[PDB]
Amino acid sequence: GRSRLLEDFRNNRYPNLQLREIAGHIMEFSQDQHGSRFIQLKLERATPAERQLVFNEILQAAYQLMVDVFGNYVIQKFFEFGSLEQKLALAERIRGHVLSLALQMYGCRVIQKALEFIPSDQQNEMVRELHQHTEQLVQDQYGNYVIQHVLEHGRPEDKSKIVAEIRGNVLVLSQHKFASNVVEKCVTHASRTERAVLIDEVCTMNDGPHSALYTMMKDQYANYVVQKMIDVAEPGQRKIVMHELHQHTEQLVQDQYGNYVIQHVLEHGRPEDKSKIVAEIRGNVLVLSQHKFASNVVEKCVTHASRTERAVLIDEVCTMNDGPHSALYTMMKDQYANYVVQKMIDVAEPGQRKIVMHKIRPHIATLRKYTYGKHILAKLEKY
RNA sequence: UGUUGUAUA
Structure with missing residues (x-):
C-alpha cells in the first residue's frame, strides 16, 4: 500500500531527504510513523516557503490528519508554528466539528493546541461550539481534558459557564472517573465565588443517611476532590469541610480510600x-x-x-x-x-x-x- | 513483609 518513496525512506535510503523531495507525498508521510517525525523535524528548520508547500498538501484533508495517530502532530505543529493565515484556515476546517474532535482520542489534542494559539475571536467561536455540549464533554474520556484546558487557561467568562453545568451535580460527578478531574479543576481554577458555591453544595446536602462529604471521602474518585476542596477552601468553609472529616475519622482511617484523605490532612x-x-x-x-x-x-x-x-x-x-x-x-x-x-x-x-x-x-x-x-x-x- | 483515579508514536 505504501509508495516506493515512503518505503525507501523507511528502509534507510535518502539519508539526506529534504522536504521538497517528498512533494506530493505529504499526506502519506503524515499518516506514517516515521514519515510524520520527518515532516515535524524538517518543519522546524524549514523556510516559510517550504512550510507553505507542506501546508497546501494537508489543508483539504486536514481533519483526516487531526484524527490520525501520526498525523495529529503535524496539525499541531502548524497550530503552534504556522502563520496566522495558516492557523485560521485550519480553524475554518474545524468549524462545525469541534465536538467530534474533542471527543476523539487524537482530535482532542488538536483542539487544545488550537485553543492555545489561535486569536480570541476564533477561540470564542471554538468554545461556543463546546458550551452546547459541556455535559457530554465533562464525562468523556477525551473531552474532559478539553474542559480542563478551558478551566486552566480559558477566559473567566467561559470557566463560569462550565461551573454552571457542574453546579448541582458536584456529588455525582465527583464519583465519576473522568468528570471528577473536572470537578477538581473547577474547585482549583474557577473564581472565588464559584469555588465556594461548589464546596457549599456538598456541605449542605445529605446522601441518604450519610453526609455528602463523608460519601465523597469514601469514594474511589471523590476522595481526590475532597482533598482539593481541603486545599483551597477559605477558612470558614474549610472548617465546615473538616468538621465532616473529624466526625468520621474513626471510619475513614479504616477505609480503603478514606485513609488517604486522613493522610493528606496529616501531611x-x-x-x-x-x-x-x-x-x-x-x-x-x-x-x-x-x-x-x-x-x-x-x-x-x-x-x-x-x-x-x-x-x-x-x-x-x-x-x-x-x-x-x-x-x-x-x-x-x-x-x-x-x-x-x-x-x-x-x-x-x-x-x-x-x-x-x-x-x-x-x-x-x-x-x-x-x-x-x-x-x-x-x-x-x-x- | 502492607493500601487509591484518565491521556498519542
Whole structure:
C-alpha cells in the first residue's frame, strides 16, 4: 500500500531527504510513523516557503490528519508554528466539528493546541461550539481534558459557564472517573465565588443517611476532590469541610480510600487538625496498627504530629499490654504493625528511642523465628 | 513483609 518513496525512506535510503523531495507525498508521510517525525523535524528548520508547500498538501484533508495517530502532530505543529493565515484556515476546517474532535482520542489534542494559539475571536467561536455540549464533554474520556484546558487557561467568562453545568451535580460527578478531574479543576481554577458555591453544595446536602462529604471521602474518585476542596477552601468553609472529616475519622482511617484523605490532612493540613486526628487515634494504636489501611495513618501520625503528640502515641505502645504480651511484641509480629514499629523507631527522640529498645530487647534473640518480626531484626542491624 | 483515579508514536 505504501509508495516506493515512503518505503525507501523507511528502509534507510535518502539519508539526506529534504522536504521538497517528498512533494506530493505529504499526506502519506503524515499518516506514517516515521514519515510524520520527518515532516515535524524538517518543519522546524524549514523556510516559510517550504512550510507553505507542506501546508497546501494537508489543508483539504486536514481533519483526516487531526484524527490520525501520526498525523495529529503535524496539525499541531502548524497550530503552534504556522502563520496566522495558516492557523485560521485550519480553524475554518474545524468549524462545525469541534465536538467530534474533542471527543476523539487524537482530535482532542488538536483542539487544545488550537485553543492555545489561535486569536480570541476564533477561540470564542471554538468554545461556543463546546458550551452546547459541556455535559457530554465533562464525562468523556477525551473531552474532559478539553474542559480542563478551558478551566486552566480559558477566559473567566467561559470557566463560569462550565461551573454552571457542574453546579448541582458536584456529588455525582465527583464519583465519576473522568468528570471528577473536572470537578477538581473547577474547585482549583474557577473564581472565588464559584469555588465556594461548589464546596457549599456538598456541605449542605445529605446522601441518604450519610453526609455528602463523608460519601465523597469514601469514594474511589471523590476522595481526590475532597482533598482539593481541603486545599483551597477559605477558612470558614474549610472548617465546615473538616468538621465532616473529624466526625468520621474513626471510619475513614479504616477505609480503603478514606485513609488517604486522613493522610493528606496529616501531611499538608493545619496542625490543630492533625492534633484532633491524633486524639481519635489515641488509645487505639495497637488495634489500628494491625489494620491494612489504618496502619498507614498511624505511621503518618507519628511522622507529622507534634513532638509531644508523637511521644504520646509511641509511649502508648511502650506502656500498654496486649493481654499477657506487651503491645510492642504483638505489633512486631503483625503483618502491618511491624511497619509501625519500624517507623516509631525512626522518628523517636533519643530518650524515647531508648525506652522502645528496652521493650524490644528481650525479644531480639528470637525475632528471627517470626515471619514479620524478623524484619524488625533486619532493620535493627542499623542501630 | 502492607493500601487509591484518565491521556498519542
